[PDB]
Amino acid sequence: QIMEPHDTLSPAQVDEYRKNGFLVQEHVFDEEEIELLRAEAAQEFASGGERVTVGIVRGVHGCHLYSEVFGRLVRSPRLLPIARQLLRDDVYVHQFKINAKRAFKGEVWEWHQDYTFWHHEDGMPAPRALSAAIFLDEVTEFNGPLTFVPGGHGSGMIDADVKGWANTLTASLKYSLDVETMRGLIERNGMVAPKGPRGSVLWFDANIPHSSVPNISPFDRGLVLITYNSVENKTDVTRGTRPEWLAARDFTPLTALQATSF
Numbered sequence: 246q247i248m249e250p251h252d253t254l255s256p257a258q259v260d261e262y263r264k265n266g267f268l269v270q271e272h273v274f275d276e277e278e279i280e281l282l283r284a285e286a287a288q289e290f291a292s293g294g295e296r297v298t299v300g301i302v303r304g305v306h307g308c309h310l311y312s313e314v315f316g317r318l319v320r321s322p323r324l325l326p327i328a329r330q331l332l333r334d335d336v337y338v339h340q341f342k343i344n345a346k347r348a349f350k351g352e353v354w355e356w357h358q359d360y361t362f363w364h365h366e367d368g369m370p371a372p373r374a375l376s377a378a379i380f381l382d383e384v385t386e387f388n389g390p391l392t393f394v395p396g397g398h399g400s401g402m403i404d405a406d407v408k409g410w411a412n413t414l415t416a417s418l419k420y421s422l423d424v425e426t427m428r429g430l431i432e433r434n435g436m437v438a439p440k441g442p443r444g445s446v447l448w449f450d451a452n453i454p455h456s457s458v459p460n461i462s463p464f465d466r467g468l469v470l471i472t473y474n475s476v477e478n479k480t481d482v483t484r485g486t487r488p489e490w491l492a493a494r495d496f497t498p499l500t501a502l503q504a505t506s507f
């Protein structure tokens with residue numbers, strides 16, 4: 246329901262986003278909305294098939310192509326307008342995934358830049374993309390928050406070690422940054438793990454270096470990540486290596502959900 250004005254970031258929020266390369270908006274969705282997304286996530290974890298990642302499952306990819314709920318979510322007036330605003334274009338979804346770190350579980354996700362994968366694997370011409378991470382649970386110091394180098398997107402794509410899409414979905418990553426490159430960045434820029442309550446959205450740049458650590462809390466950390474790409478910056482489908490549920494190929498510009506009686 247687009248029953249009120251489309252959401253936009255304030256000028257200060259935009260500046261903060263461009264300068265740091267990430268930004269948290271608190272309390273975007275309420276508990277009932279988050280519960281609908283948790284239930285739909287659980288159903289996709291149960292029947293995603295080859296799109297799932299694992300012991301017990303912690304990942305699924307491309308759900309907005311298969312789920313009515315997730316298809317509407319990406320068009321939400323809480324999300325689509327800000328993605329247009331930050332990318333200064335019409336947009337489409339390049340990638341959709343859900344990442345759960347359960348209580349007392351999780352892995353060390355090595356430092357990486359999303360754009361590096363999308364440039365090399367999918368043919369994304371420029372880093373004119375971003376991810377919206379919806380917090381299905383409160384993100385704290387202790388349940389494995391996404392961790393960033395603030396301003397580290399202004400490096401461009403950093404020269405990365407390489408180890409098809411064999412290890413793109415897994416915490417041992419195909420493209421990871423040197424112990425060496427990372428020290429220089431962090432001495433200069435520091436590190437930040439954005440936190441916020443359930444229903445928050447964390448916007449981050451395609452090129453920001455990020456990482457995370459296990460969840461040593463007794464609470465789950467579920468994240469829905471929607472990667473919006475500029476339509477002008479659509480991926481070169483001739484250099485693409487991965488299926489539609491990792492890298493979308495329908496570049497129709499999205500429009501927002503209209504308010505309807507159903």
Ligand SMILES: O=C(O)[C@H]1NCC[C@@H]1O
Pocket residue numbers: 340357358359362363413414
């Ligand atoms: O491979 C991908 O496209 C995603 N998984 C880890 C880095 C990206 O977000």
